[PDB]
């Protein structure tokens, strides 16, 4: 009886890769691959404690550009630090962390056990994170590189694998619900929420009082651990199809830092959506009922051939990943 759940429009199915036709695009610059191979080759030769498979990091950025199409732009190599754990040199906010394994070819593939362990790590972060909603937390990307050096060229086989939670969020438009006019609620409905900038998303959580009115809460409020929560609010997107909205829903469903979620995926929870294109927020009832630990995954690979002498160009390599429940890349060129 907290709100009316009668559907006021078509159901929508939300997922990270919905807008991109289930396609994940990876762009990798030749320069960072050249630095990765250069660093790897020195260790394997002029150094003796080199493990046969070197462990490095590539650093990328997550961009969303045409109808919510997600692209990872990988352009930085990072050997990483040892602390006993292997971590990047300096983690920048907005960095996609891609573990890079490479080995000199002599005399490679992703297995489901490797995908499974990556997804366990992914969901453990979703359950335990205390940070703001981040789309980068919704995918785990890895690269295997096999390289060879001869007198003529450097050759590299680059294989990339990803795991993404498969959960679909069912979203139903509902009638508007009264919001207590706190300062946060007033600033979200105010004139400043009308902009046109990319990656200006923010989100929080929705509490409820004795009068069954909604209270908006910042994502950093320490009371979130036990305040009774009924859903989320999202600001700075054009529509509900933005993958950030699904990311906030997933984060709310998975988080074990929120111990008093009296409305969740089984009962349906509320989304107060402040879009950038409308003066008033949209109200949705979101639900999830499928398998919680199911994931999509697949791999893609391509060869690159590099001259010994580097050319000051911006050459890059594009990989297309359309993962599914069965591990098949459903991309056809």
Residue numbers in the entry: 13 to 95, 103 to 126, 132 to 357
Q: What does the original paper state about this entry?
A:
Here we demonstrate that CEP85 is essential for faithful centriole duplication through a direct interaction with the previously uncharacterised N-terminal domain of STIL, a key factor involved in the early steps of centriole formation. Subsequently, through its C-terminal PB3, PLK4 interacts with STIL and phosphorylates it, enabling STIL to recruit SASS6 to the site of procentriole assembly.
The NTD of STIL revealed a global structural similarity to the N-terminal domain of the autophagy-related protein ATG7, a protein–protein interaction domain that forms binary complexes with Atg10 and Atg356. It is composed of two subdomains that are structurally akin to each other suggesting that this domain might have evolved via a domain duplication and fusion event. The common structural core of both subdomains consists of a six-stranded open β-barrel capped at the top and on one side with α-helices, a fold that resembles the so-called MPN/JAB1/PAD-1/JAMM domain, as observed, for example, in eIF3f. Interestingly, we found that these capping helices and their vicinity in both STIL NTD subdomains define the most conserved patches on their surface making them prime candidates for a role in protein–protein interactions, in this instance binding to CEP85 cc4. The structure of the STIL NTD showed the presence of two conserved patches on its surface. Thus, it is possible that the STIL NTD binds other factors, as yet undiscovered, that might compete or synergise with CEP85 binding or be involved in CEP85 independent functions.
